[PDB]
From a paper:
Encapsulins are protein nanocompartments that house various cargo enzymes, including a family of decameric ferritin-like proteins. Cargo enzymes are directed inside the encapsulin nanocompartment by a terminal localization sequence (LS) that binds to the interior face of the encapsulin. Together, the encapsulin EncFtn (Enc:EncFtn) complex can perform both the oxidation and storage functions of classical ferritins. Here, we investigate the structure of the Enc:EncFtn nanocompartment from the halophilic bacterium [name] to gain a better understanding of the arrangement and stoichiometry of the complex.
Motivated by the apparent interior density in the Loaded-Enc sample, we performed single-particle cryo-EM on the Loaded-Enc nanocompartment complex. Regions of the reconstruction around the icosahedral fivefold axes displayed a lower resolution than the other regions of the structure in a local resolution map. The monomer of the encapsulin nanocompartment from the reconstruction displays a HK97-fold typical for encapsulins, with the position of the E-loop broadly determining the topology of the encapsulin nanocage. With the imposition of I1 symmetry on the reconstruction, the EncFtn cargo is not visible within the lumen. This suggests that the organization of the EncFtn protein within the encapsulin shell does not conform to icosahedral symmetry and is rotationally averaged through our symmetry-imposed processing.
Residue numbers in the entry:
A (entry chain A), B (entry chain A), C (entry chain A): 2 to 266
Amino acid sequence: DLLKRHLAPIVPDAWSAIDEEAKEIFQGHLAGRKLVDFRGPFGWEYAAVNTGELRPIDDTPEDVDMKLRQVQPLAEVRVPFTLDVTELDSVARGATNPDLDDVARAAERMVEAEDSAIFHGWAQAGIKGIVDSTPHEALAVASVSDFPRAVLSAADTLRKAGVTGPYALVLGPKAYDDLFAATQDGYPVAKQVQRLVVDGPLVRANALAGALVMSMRGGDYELTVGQDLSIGYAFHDRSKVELFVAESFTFRVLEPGAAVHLRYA
Amino acid sequence: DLLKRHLAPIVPDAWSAIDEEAKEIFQGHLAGRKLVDFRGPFGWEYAAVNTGELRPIDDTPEDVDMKLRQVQPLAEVRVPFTLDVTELDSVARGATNPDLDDVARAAERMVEAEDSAIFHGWAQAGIKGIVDSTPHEALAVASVSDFPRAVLSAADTLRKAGVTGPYALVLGPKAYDDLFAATQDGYPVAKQVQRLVVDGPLVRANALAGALVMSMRGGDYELTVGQDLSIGYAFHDRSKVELFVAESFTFRVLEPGAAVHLRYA
Amino acid sequence: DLLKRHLAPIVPDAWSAIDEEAKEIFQGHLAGRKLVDFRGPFGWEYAAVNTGELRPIDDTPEDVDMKLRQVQPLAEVRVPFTLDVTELDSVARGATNPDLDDVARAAERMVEAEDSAIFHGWAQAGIKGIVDSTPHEALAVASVSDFPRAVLSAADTLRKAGVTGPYALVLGPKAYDDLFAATQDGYPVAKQVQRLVVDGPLVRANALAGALVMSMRGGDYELTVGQDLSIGYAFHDRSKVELFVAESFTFRVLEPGAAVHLRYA
């Protein structure tokens, strides 16, 4: 009831239309949720992730030893958007293409925020992502044909760093497009690369600079979601209605050495 | 009974022969019906598609607000053709190849009309097609080998425009022939292109200029058919019998930004 | 749910009071709905009436014949009004005469709009009424005593025009008052007139200029109502609440020669 959706001047079918418009973008753009570990939605009142460490408190007496637990507080993010009440009424009159452009804009903005956090961190929320926290040095992939061998090198790094398990290749939009549009003497590079990596389709990540190789053994990267992506009502005028996309989440790099960055090719 | 078929001097087997000749062409040339949404045949008395919008009426008093509903009236199209009564009698005498050339000519003319409407519109009937109404700028495919990368670019456009879902590639006759006859260093381009798009066979569209990429998520383009393609009787002489192919249809572009044109390669 | 009534700061009993105030006026002033054919309320998404005709499209090729279906799009009309929240609260405190004057004003305004459309048309909505579309010439009724004979003449016209069936006499307010207040040598004219027409009570129409005679055989005039007369909520202040009366309707003159106008007496 924190979304206050029943207070909106919106017919149920328009609610379904907005939800479908957002959900299609979320399932078609959330690369992070498909490749890291995901701790299920815990609700609104889930506040922080228990990391398990302890911090030694200075200036304590000798007869007592005092330590402070360490936690990772979640970040709650809301992106507002606005819709026309007449457009939403249209769907009650049988219309099937109401103007839901701002719904898509806000949904992609939220996807951008969460994925940029997952990959390249978020200093304000105290989140370090996969790329900004790996200790290895990023491989250089001079050309698209360099992708197979470089990928193998990455895997070697992960085996020499102790990180076993099948390794997935994640591609930024430029990298994904160039790899899948490339042929080596007619033979497509993507076929060889897919032979060298996990059997699943290669993940295209919009918010990833260059490319990445990461272990999928599990337990390396954990995304905690308190309140999953939701659409809620804020206010409304005679003609304009204000909604928001809301999510409470945090991201933890359990094993920083479980992924290797690859500069763009 | 609007086709008045029982009034024709045609034996039932000749009716079946004409129907088969038309139906084979319809299933082998109707590309539009296989790639857009199709609202089922509603019958003869289905007049218009309810778009759901409202139009503000000018010059109205202050104490009243008046709006006019908006609809898309269907177009009813008949193409006549003529057959020899003796040729149609032949099939009652065991003949299996009666001269049904005009049946094929009329059937392909109707296919041409409907597909040209679907792709490039029809101003007289107030129909805008997929190509004439997309807002993006058509990609340039200089050569057949340019097809993969260009296709990827198209998909990128659709993802940046919010149009998710699997993307199908539709080919004009020239484009289809050149793509499927082409090899890059021996490797066929069509294999790579088919790897880059939906798993179904690529659709060849005779009435398409260049090529097209379009989302198949559904809800983007809607073809409404009131009366499906039918053969009806008009008049007959001592030797000549006049029939027609009849169809009542309209086509709506729900989301103009759901498809990208590609100039021919 | 297009009326959004559950969002209003109005107790259920005040809703019932407003509905009763409107419904009494609607049943006591809607003359059109009692004398024309009425196609039932089809809902909000019913857009247009299928007239059944076809229009020949110019500039079409010879091998194809193209015709456009003809429809009559409905008109959606909303008249706003405003009520005091304190007055509506009074009914929760046992009050039985809350100030619902604006409810009556809006209800009579809507009755005026619909009946004026039915009788004298509405150019903006593309509606022709009964009076403006009859082909005969309006009879002249010099005095109230002229009513019987003139009425008979009207019936004669309808029989000579082929329009059979019992004929009803509809009276404008001036005509109704003058006829029912008139006596010929003590004998009331209304008795003779009622003997000459259908057994039902003569209909008083507020929005009718002069009088009218019309066949009640059925199939002559058709009123289509998509959304029937309803009261809906628009907005509200701390003290003021805005509602509206809403209706989607259109009116069709199937047989223009089925009624005769009579100039006022």
